[PDB]
Amino acid sequence: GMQIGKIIKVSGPLVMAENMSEASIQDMCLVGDLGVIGEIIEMRQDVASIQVYEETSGIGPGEPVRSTGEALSVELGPGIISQMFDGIQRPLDTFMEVTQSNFLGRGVQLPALDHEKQWWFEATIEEGTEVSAGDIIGYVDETKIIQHKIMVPNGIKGTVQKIESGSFTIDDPICVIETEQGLKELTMMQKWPVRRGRPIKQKLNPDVPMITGQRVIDTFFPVTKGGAAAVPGPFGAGKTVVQHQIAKWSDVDLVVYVGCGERGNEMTDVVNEFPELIDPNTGESLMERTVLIANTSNMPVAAREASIYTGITIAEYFRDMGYDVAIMADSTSRWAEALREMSGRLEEMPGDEGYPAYLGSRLAEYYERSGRVIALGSDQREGSITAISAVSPSGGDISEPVTQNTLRVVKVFWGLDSSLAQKRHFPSINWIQSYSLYSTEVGRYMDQILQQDWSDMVTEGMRILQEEEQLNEIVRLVGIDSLSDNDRLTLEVAKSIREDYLQQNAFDDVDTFTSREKQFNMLKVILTFGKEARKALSLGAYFNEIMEGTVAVRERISRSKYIPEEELAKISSINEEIKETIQLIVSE
Amino acid sequence: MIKEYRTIKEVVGPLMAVEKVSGVKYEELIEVRMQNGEIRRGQVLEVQEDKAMVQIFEGTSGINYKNSSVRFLGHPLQLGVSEDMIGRVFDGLGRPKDNGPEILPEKYLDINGEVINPIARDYPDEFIQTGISAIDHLNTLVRGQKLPVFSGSGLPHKELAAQIARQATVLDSSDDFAVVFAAIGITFEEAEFFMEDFRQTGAIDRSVMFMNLANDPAIERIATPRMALTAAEYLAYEKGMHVLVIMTDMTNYAEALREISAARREVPGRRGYPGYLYTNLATLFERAGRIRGLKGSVTQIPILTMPEDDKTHPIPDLTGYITEGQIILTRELYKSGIQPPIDVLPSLSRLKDKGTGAGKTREDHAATMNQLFAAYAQGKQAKELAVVLGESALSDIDKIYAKFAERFENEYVNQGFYTNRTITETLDLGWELLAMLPRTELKRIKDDLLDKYLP
Amino acid sequence: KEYRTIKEVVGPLMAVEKVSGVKYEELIEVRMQNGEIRRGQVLEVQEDKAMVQIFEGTSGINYKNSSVRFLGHPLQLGVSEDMIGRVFDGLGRPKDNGPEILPEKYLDINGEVINPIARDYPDEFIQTGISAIDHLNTLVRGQKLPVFSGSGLPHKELAAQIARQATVLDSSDDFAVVFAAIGITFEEAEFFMEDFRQTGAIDRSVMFMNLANDPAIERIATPRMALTAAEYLAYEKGMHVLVIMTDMTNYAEALREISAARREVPGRRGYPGYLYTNLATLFERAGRIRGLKGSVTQIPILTMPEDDKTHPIPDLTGYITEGQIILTRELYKSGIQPPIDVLPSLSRLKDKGTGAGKTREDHAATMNQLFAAYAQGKQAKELAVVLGESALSDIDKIYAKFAERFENEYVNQGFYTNRTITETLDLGWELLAMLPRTELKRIKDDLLDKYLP
Ligand SMILES: Nc1ncnc2c1ncn2[C@@H]1O[C@H](COP(=O)(O)OP(=O)(O)NP(=O)(O)O)[C@@H](O)[C@H]1O
Ligand SMILES: [Mg+2]
């Protein structure tokens, strides 16, 4: 029957096999006696070059190879939320139970989803309806909050002849469609090739800001729902903490976290902590909205690339249902380095710094899969994918191909700084070099939704921080004493911005998250101290006296980050205490 | 001249080797008819004996070499041109993506085009008032010029190009420009910005657009600007239109060239770019200008992002060796709020002499331009000294130049993306700034101009 | 089946022709003309040819008159509890003139990846006895926490001191040290051997000793054999294992030599492009496993070439480990033992091993307060020496004095002095007592009352 190839060479994760004349580029293969998972990447006559997503130790020439006739795919259906998969979508907990091992073996094939679990399918589409790709025929309450909508798969068109509510496994046929080819049965599960972007109707401008709860991000460098943000930085600067924070507190529907070539403990930390972080509004834990893709640094190198596409394809699937999804990639540098390793094995001609010549276009194709969209289907529902990507440049030097190619396509840059991290200023975002091309439009959204002049507060705060940069160079020229009273007040206000607003401890119970309105009140209080103090100085007041008469109120400002969310009146009351204290000082 | 072979020998990335063929030609268009029913277009890169090396525009994923076939179509890649292209949107290969009716072509044109005979050229010399002072006065654009924008990631080159297209006018020509827009590997948001601006101004109804986005196959980027330029030369030289060609981002074009070059295992030039990158780029950018006796014209504004903001990278360096100047945006001016963030000192226009002066702009054009350049260069050096050594170190004359450079950046260059200055307003503002300096410092300007124009 | 078909020899690499049934990473044996046996590993296998690396090198091998034997399994370590107390060379052969180990089983020295689902997060205190580590950069069971050093700095003495003093307060007699020496000098080897033997640390240790004079491809195997022994002791025998490996810069050198012999294109600064991944296959073997009592803790030790932390070896190590301990030449010149600079040092997982029930309730607060005061005082010293004593404020002069005492008496404890965690925290309170109470903002006031005289 089916053609059986024969290994002729093994060198790390690169296998070459002859007698593969009937196979196609990008077909998945079972390689060797063990049948480890691999992918055909190029062919010269009957000899296929295969990259293997598992360890190849113990494999040699003469063993069989067998194409599956299908490209690298994911199973998409009920049972995918709250799971942790490896890079090729194998469920790591089932892996542990089936093999009865605490360690990762090979050659064992496990279905991605539970095909024996019973789910309640609620039919919502009437018989006789004409349907096409993306149309919703029913749903499953996978979680109490999240409806898993069952969509007609791409490439299926026809009229519904039989549909029935009931309890089914993901293998059972739940709907019958009459097509020109014939009658077609649909289950709750569809497969999709990870390297192909899931089709949409059209992209839309991503213009609604995401609420990360991180003050420096939401205020100064905001990302939108459907936008893309890069967070490049040296080791220990805080990339992973930033991503965990966004994963915990962002106001999206679903989070897909891809651990791409990083530490095993950090994946273990999510599966431990997320089920214990319970939403007070709905009573559901963070794990009830999360999908984990994990391929650690010492896991098969080629599976780092797989984990990226597995993650984005799952995100696109839930986007198509009409949800807002965030996908974190930690770290895209490890994916790029995997490409560089395989490129050397293939003896390709290098591009920049050893990376394949197609590095830039691969990165660009990945981020074009993020975005706000109109999904396919008659209802034209909208969903989005927000992409947050760590980048890990050697020595923290951002002038390297992965960072540079990423900044060509994303609109938000959170540049982490070594000096800030060593000074324990976290998040270590360099507020001078970082930027968000969404700032202006987000400013208009915020002004309208708060009914406040938020955009001008953000501008003034950034002006103060930029004047701190210039004044620091002037202190460098002649020292602090030469500076005017207004200059030294500016330094104090910027100091309050850095310490009472920008600095935010992800590990503190209150400080770890700051609501949109608490952010508004904190920044108003800080800038109000600036407004009132200058007015005093113009009225003849003295900066040193203003400082000595405002110790207690400035203490309140420094602690407003710890004020509970139900007590925000304690923050907003600070302003009038500021006025009264400074007015009394100029009187004295 | 059509031939069909089922003799594919190798499938490696974007390239395919076909053997046992005959009658195949260099640059011939081909179709791969895949075992699964898909049809993918390509081009013959090289032919020898019974073999032919081809590139596939849509890549080679899912191809079984043994049960696929290659059809050689007997002609090179062409664009079916027609006046009906106006107001339509095409993908990178000239296929419509706007759901409109397919074009009935007047004729089919090899998208490589042909070189204009140097003795048939008319020299570009008609002033185009962009409304942007840093361009009109210091780096003057003339109709038929190739004048690119050199930018960087995160910088507002799309706003600058949209502003130019929106405000550009030749003073003694009432025809609107026809706009040919070529998107090359750009994001949806980049392309949507141009789409929205063209719809708002109504320019979309006099535009032709070829859209290759970052989700489209990278090898298609190689054809996209040739499709655009072939459309442009048709509308200009056969239909008599004044065509403005905006192409972005040319760095993405160069990177696609390097992917093919690497797949072919060619001898890599600087930074892996092929040794023929200069020539290949010249075959695009020299497709601009005017022809003696024909009414239309082709003006090109390519846009590229300089990798690591480095003007000596091969892509900006070779582009600068080809084009007729360049408009450079910088991060330091952008961070200071300057809009557009044009740094005039490394910017240039090579066609400004015969496009300016009495009867074109005004008799004081070139002298005030040269004086403003010298005064800005001296003032920027003065400001650089003041930062390194303090304001007190600066001499009193250099304090004037440092302030001059501040006002130059803040009032002259910084005009806004929706501000349309006449050339007279621009030149008058140039004189207001030159008035800051003592008359004895204006060596570039002769006395009659100073007596006549200087306050 | 012995093959007389060696084709060529390139450095440590060897090509074997007319082979059949050979596997990637298979162990091989070369029988030389003089009769000695050299082991090796299949790096690449194609058609009827195999490419192998010889751990002891190819010098003195006449390939035409030597034969090759393929052994049908990867390189393994014969593990046994009797390895405790024994000294081995870089290839796992006895070095102490003691009997050959009778193994309980043989384990592929590459090990296997721990399933992330099966991992337990690092927890509970490891007392190194070194204040700068235990208080400010706490080592936790299952963590990877490296030492970044430089040539001429005393990382040798620090490694010995940690091996000698490390202990868990929680448990008794279940703590073991696995020590891997990589490319070290003969005198360095002498020093480690006598230290372990004279203190009795050898009686809870396993040593794998590769010396600079030894063949350098042995270094590839040495850390992998150490980690295989550690994983056995921890996960099959339930011990708390501390693995100390020095010097990892000598490990990278071996990788570079293999890369050169294979004519691979070099990566950044001449090191292989896969340097990060290769190091990850070592350092990620640390951790804990759910349902098993043991643990593997790692302290890789490396010298930063030219004291440059952006060099690929420290940079990539920092991108894998969970913090780092930095030794500096400035503190070493001042006589600070150990010369740990706490400002660039960090332990990421420290909070999992500190507080009431593990160390003491004041641990975290005094850590933050000492660190803040020390940074401020080091900055005060930086102004005073550069700008004179008079320019510094009166409050700043206090912080300068504090910083000096912090270095001279808190960090500088001596390479042969062990401090309990109580002694360290009490000493920390004695230093904070230099500062006025109005400056201890980070510490809660009831803690201040209780612990301050
Ligand atoms: N937001 C934060 N609040 C408090 N501490 C932080 C924060 N971010 C980082 N840190 C500290 O910095 C350490 C390193 O953070 P981490 O997110 O692991 O950095 P990283 O950039 O991902 N390191 P790496 O994976 O090696 O490139 C943490 O262990 C914390 O001590
Ligand atoms: Mg990290």
Coordinates of N, CA, C and O in Angstrom, one line a residue, chain C residues 153 327-336 339 341 374 378 381-382 407:
Chain C
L153 N 40.4 35.8 40.1 CA 39.5 35.9 41.2 C 39.4 34.6 42.0 O 39.7 33.5 41.4
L327 N 31.4 38.0 41.3 CA 32.6 38.4 42.0 C 33.4 39.5 41.3 O 33.4 39.4 40.0
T328 N 33.9 40.5 42.0 CA 34.6 41.6 41.3 C 36.0 41.8 41.7 O 36.4 41.5 42.9
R329 N 36.8 42.4 40.8 CA 38.2 42.6 41.2 C 38.4 43.8 42.1 O 39.3 43.8 42.9
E330 N 37.4 44.7 42.1 CA 37.5 45.8 43.1 C 37.3 45.3 44.5 O 38.1 45.7 45.4
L331 N 36.3 44.5 44.8 CA 36.2 44.0 46.1 C 37.3 43.0 46.5 O 37.7 43.0 47.7
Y332 N 37.8 42.3 45.5 CA 39.0 41.4 45.8 C 40.2 42.2 46.2 O 41.0 41.8 47.1
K333 N 40.4 43.3 45.5 CA 41.6 44.2 45.9 C 41.5 44.7 47.3 O 42.5 44.8 48.0
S334 N 40.3 45.0 47.8 CA 40.0 45.4 49.2 C 40.1 44.3 50.2 O 39.9 44.6 51.4
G335 N 40.4 43.1 49.8 CA 40.4 42.0 50.7 C 39.1 41.4 51.2 O 39.1 40.7 52.2
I336 N 38.0 41.6 50.4 CA 36.7 41.1 50.8 C 36.6 39.6 50.4 O 36.7 39.3 49.2
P339 N 34.5 38.0 47.5 CA 34.3 39.3 46.9 C 33.1 39.4 46.1 O 33.1 39.7 44.9
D341 N 29.8 41.1 44.8 CA 29.1 42.4 44.6 C 27.6 42.2 44.6 O 27.1 41.7 43.5
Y374 N 22.9 50.0 51.2 CA 24.2 49.8 50.7 C 24.4 50.5 49.3 O 25.5 51.0 49.0
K378 N 27.2 53.2 48.8 CA 28.2 53.1 47.7 C 28.2 54.3 46.8 O 29.2 54.8 46.4
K381 N 29.9 57.0 48.8 CA 31.4 56.9 48.7 C 31.8 57.4 47.3 O 32.9 58.0 47.2
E382 N 31.0 57.1 46.3 CA 31.4 57.5 44.9 C 31.5 59.0 44.8 O 32.4 59.6 44.1
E407 N 30.7 46.0 53.6 CA 31.7 45.3 52.9 C 32.7 44.6 53.8 O 33.1 43.5 53.6

